[PDB]
Amino acid sequence: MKRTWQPNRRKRAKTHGFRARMRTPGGRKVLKRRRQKGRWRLTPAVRK
Amino acid sequence: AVKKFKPYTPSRRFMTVADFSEITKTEPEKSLVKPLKKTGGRNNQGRITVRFRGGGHKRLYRIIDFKRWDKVGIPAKVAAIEYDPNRSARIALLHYVDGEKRYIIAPDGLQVGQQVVAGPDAPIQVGNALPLRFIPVGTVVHAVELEPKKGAKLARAAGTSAQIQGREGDYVILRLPSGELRKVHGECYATVGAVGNADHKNIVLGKAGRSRWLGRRPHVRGAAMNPVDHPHGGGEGRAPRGRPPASPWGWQTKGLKTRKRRKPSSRFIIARRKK
RNA sequence: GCGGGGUGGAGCAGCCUGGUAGCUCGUCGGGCUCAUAACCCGAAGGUCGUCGGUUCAAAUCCGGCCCCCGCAACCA
RNA sequence: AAAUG
């Protein structure tokens, strides 16, 4: 049947993307937190 | 004069339609339409705040002239009578000798080709707008302002009207469509006549789909829900109310009054409504 | 198993608070009527389901037994 | 108020 993952680059960038993160106290905390952890990628990669 | 159908489907048995015999023009005035932004019953938070709304026919909004004291003394001609999907009344297209074009809601008896006028000097004739103080006592009137220059607020639905009952100081006394007796200010404008399309009340929707065309989504009873949802929810099998019948939010709904006590307009209401 | 009840012939009070049995109807006698009903006047009829106890004294309070209503008998 | 044979 139709499964849960239906990839869509525009949706991915708008929902989880860097600029969505910086727009919001919680999203800026995600970025600060993944930096402090040393994540190589702060945000999901998506091609555009 | 509502029209019936023959029982060639189950739903056509009782479905009725308007006769549409007063309409003379079947597309709106382009300079006077603007998009109606459908809401779905959702507010600026995105929340349903009025349940069971959505999914009706698309509609353009026809701008309506609820002031009319905008163009005192400038007569106009009734150029057409048109369908308006945003209200029960029909609307009338006015061609002012000014060259300006406006819409008004169409009173009963208004004829395409006649002339209308607004102002203190206007004849007491169907379709004319005067301040309440210049209309003779006893006249049936419609599209009545509720405060000076704030716009017609009363009696705008198909077939409705208000009747002037008497006067007292700067205020005249009106019987509203609800049967309430209110004091309205004398400088408030109104329009001689009753709103047309009085047969509107006698329309039988006929089937479920018709409500859906009107943006009316299926309403579901509290009694059919669970206790998480509604005071009437639950019970094994069917169940009576088991308490004072209540809204989804708990407040009583058979008889419990709800107008604010200390509301300033109380001084100007003489008698709560009838029946 | 839990609650209520049994008192003239019928249906009900009195029991809770021990000493005093009461109301309507019916029954009997007499009136009125030609007569009957209705109506009026007077009367009789209950030892209180039963046995046992407490008490100076028990329809009344406490037990046993009989009888009649009502409720319950669920997870299984 | 006043039924019946």
Add this chain to the structure above:
RNA sequence: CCGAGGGUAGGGCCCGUGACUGGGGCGAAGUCGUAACAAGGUAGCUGUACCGGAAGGUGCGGCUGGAU
């Protein structure tokens, strides 16, 4: 080919019969009341409507085939 008829299927009229049910008729005498005939003790009758153990009652309108 037609064709007595036989067969299959679906209809129409009539008759008989049927748990039960509806009122009707008849059979002197029981139970309940007293609706009508006198102004029958609320004049009656009436078409209709609602009601009631029963006759009946009441409403609206009609008739005199109503007394005084």
Add this chain to the structure above:
RNA sequence: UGGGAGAGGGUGGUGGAAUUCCCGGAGUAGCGGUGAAAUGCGCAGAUACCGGGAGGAACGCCGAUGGCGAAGGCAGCCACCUGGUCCACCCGUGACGCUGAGGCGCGAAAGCGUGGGGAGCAAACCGGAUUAGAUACCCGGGUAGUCCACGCCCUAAACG
């Protein structure tokens, strides 16, 4: 041709008396009701009286043994639309008449449908009385209905 009398019919408009309700005033111990009462209403200010307002229905005197219509039936007043009918003149057509199975239309009240309206009245219903009882008569209430529009019903002691 010229005249006439009439609640004949339909539409719209309009007048005053009264009942009820509401607001103001003035006022106090009862009002109402019956055979007599009670229910009911009233010191939370009723009834009775004065002023104002809203609304519905019916039209007093004239009025009669009267008039009109085929019948049912029709009554304040005004205007419009319209039917029937009698009279005089003796002018016109020249039997063009009478009746009428069917058919069609009209048809008190009650009743029914969809709206509206709702003062008074009032089946049902409730209460107070009476009574052996009183699902009645009498009393206090009171919903349909009575009123309007449209559409049905088609009955009668629709009788002279």
Add this chain to the structure above:
RNA sequence: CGAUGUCGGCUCGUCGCAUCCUGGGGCUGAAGAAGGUCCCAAGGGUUGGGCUGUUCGCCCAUUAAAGCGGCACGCGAGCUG
């Protein structure tokens, strides 16, 4: 109770005998025939259908007869549900 799946049916049987039939008997209020009753006997046999989920039961048509019980009210790592 860190699981022993529970009524009835179907399928497959197997055992007990307090024996439904068939075999052998005694007593009889056993004339014959047909029964009654008790004794011996478990080798075999012990039908099809209507109703109900039913087991049971009633009923229809037959039969030599239309037995009663146990096997985790036999049998769901065999089926049904």
Add this chain to the structure above:
RNA sequence: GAAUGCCGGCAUGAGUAACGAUAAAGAGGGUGAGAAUCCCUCUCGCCGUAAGCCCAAGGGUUCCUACGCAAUGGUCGUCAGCGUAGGGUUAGGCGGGACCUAAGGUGAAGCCGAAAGGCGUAGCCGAAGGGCAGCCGGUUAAUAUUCCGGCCCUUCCCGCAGGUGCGAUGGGGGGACGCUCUAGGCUAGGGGGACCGGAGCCAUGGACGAGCCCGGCCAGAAGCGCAGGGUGGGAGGUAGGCAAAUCCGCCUCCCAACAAGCUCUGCGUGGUGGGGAAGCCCGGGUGACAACCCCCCGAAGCCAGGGAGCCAAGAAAAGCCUCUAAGCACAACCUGCGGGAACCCGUACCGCAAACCGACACAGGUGGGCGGGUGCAAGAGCACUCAGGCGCGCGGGAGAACCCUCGCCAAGGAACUCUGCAAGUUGGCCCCGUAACUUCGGGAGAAGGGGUGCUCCCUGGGGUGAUGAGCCCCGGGGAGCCGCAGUGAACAGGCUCUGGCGACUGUUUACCAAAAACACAGCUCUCUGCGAACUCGUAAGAGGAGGUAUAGGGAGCGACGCUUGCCCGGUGCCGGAAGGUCAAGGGGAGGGGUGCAAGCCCCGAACCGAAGCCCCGGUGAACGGCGGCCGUAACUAUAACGGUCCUAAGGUAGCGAAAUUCCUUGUCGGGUAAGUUCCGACCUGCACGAAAAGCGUAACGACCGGAGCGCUGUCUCGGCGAGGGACCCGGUGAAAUUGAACUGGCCGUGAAGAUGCGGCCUACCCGUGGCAGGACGAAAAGACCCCGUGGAGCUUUACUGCAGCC
């Protein structure tokens, strides 16, 4: 040494199940160390509204070539979407940006919130909508509307000429709109041709033929032609379109009116440039100077912003045109021509799938366009088949039980079973014919029957065209022929009678419930006078609604028909300027502490003092409720009638052993040979009953009962056959589970059901196909039950708070 412990390693089950759709294979020849599996040819089968082709999303080099086969590939591998390396994606016109707006998002002004932040008109962002200029062929191993060739076109800049009051973010027009049905003319696509072009072919009994087989076009500027869309011209007045306006709107006059004209599309033609089969010979070359024509069918596509009808009444903004404003009229704009200028990103490849979403090369899921031919009434259905693509990445044998999917069956025909569950039957079209009942539509495809192929003869109407020939589409009549059988294959209703429930079409528990549940038109109560009520939010602000009582919210009931009784004592809600109670506050009789004292400080009675409650009323389609005992009639029975107690009032109509009836399989009747179900009655209704509606109701239902006809392997009662497995051989090779095991029967015993104890009995060692009685077999720390002063959802006149409201 144990914790269903943790991490790791390795065992067992086992050479076992499986190797992923039953569309299918065989042989020859190549390559190579090795070949069922790679390459080539021939034969066979499968898809063909796809299993072919083209877009979009997503994926991200998977594309092409060379060289490889350790691992990946369910086997193999010389092959590959795998490993290494090299190569490959070319645009002014296609898509997106340098254009526009939609929901939404953001947001100068402004508003709000302890902080964080929440709003908000304009503006800005935002597309698969609007707008906008490229068609055909060739070429590469791999890209092409991109390169090349031909023929076209757009914008910007500069210039030249001609023209004009030029000029805008401002005004205005336009852009600009639904659903259904649909005209005319075209095109796409297709069928046929006795005509045109073509390498050839004559087989096996016949044909050298008007034979067979193949093909008979594509793009195109101006002009022209055909078919359509769009659009009135002039003048005068002018107060409206937030300045102005010659524009637009409004008024009057004159001409014009299915037209015409002007303008814009489509189609045809068109200089020109392209393509071009079978067959044969090694992707190529020849065919070829290829031919390129006639008739018919014909869209849902085009002309298009066409037409008609209908109600539910159907985006915006820019491009564009017009109008003027500052300004400027050496400018500036319009038109024609010329030169120049024209940026950024995507472009490979898969794309119904082995490359996307499902952990897999996974029988699942994935939006748009094309989707040929014949026949079957039609069609995108069905069978076959073209182009094109495939035989599904383990095979070879065997021909047991058993399983799956399938075929047939003597006699019977539901006897099967909870149930005709399942499977038969029926089945398309044309004609004849069709009942109760009904809301007059329907019920209806009711039921039931007949016809159906092929040949010849005769003939009626229509389209194209010409009025004819031909072609094409509907039919009509007569005479015949063959078979068991003519919708000869494939696709395609079993029917009737009768109850229950729900009016109906709809909706639901994604993944055990599709229903009688939800919803539904309709009915009633109730709230709401507008800054409405109500809802969301601390607020601002929103929804309600740019709506206004014929409207909006809440609640119950649930088409329709005939109806919906009695109780207001309790609770609720509504009304009630009295009275009772009533907090803060006011008041301050009268007391107190302290100081020498003026004083400072405290307690404090009456009395005034909201809502709420008490109290008085109303109210049921408000919560709800609608009796008991005893007697009584021709000497039976029963009780119309009566007595008495209680209540706020004692269940009305209608219905009733019912989706409700305990006793119960009530009793009687019907149907059956037999009827716990069913249907019709009765009424002692354990425990119907009137909008948690009562009783009915045509039509409807994958709902739940009962019955009959038809027909059947459901059954008596089973038999045979088919294929895919199971079985054997070669390849690859799991799993839960497992204290260890050298693991028998009976009768006992034992923590009460023993392979493991006792006594007896039986028993050579080890496997393979099978069956499931046991190993209290496996799985899941029982979901029932209890326990825990464990948890959570839900309720209320439990307690205590809070929001909210007064």
Add this chain to the structure above:
RNA sequence: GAGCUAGCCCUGGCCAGGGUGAAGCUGGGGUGAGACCCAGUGGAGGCCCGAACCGGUGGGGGAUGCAAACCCCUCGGAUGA
């Protein structure tokens, strides 16, 4: 976290073919005029049959599956909520 799912908002797209034959309109009859009746035309509808598409009724299979909901036969809707 609404790339699954539920509702709504904006903007697009899709629904082979066949059947039934409402209103209206035209004509004819009818009548004082009417209603109304007949025929033709017309093309309505949460109408009918049936693909795509959307479903998920009954059964069988599957059950360490092809699949953590699938396959086959059958069946519901298919201009509309």
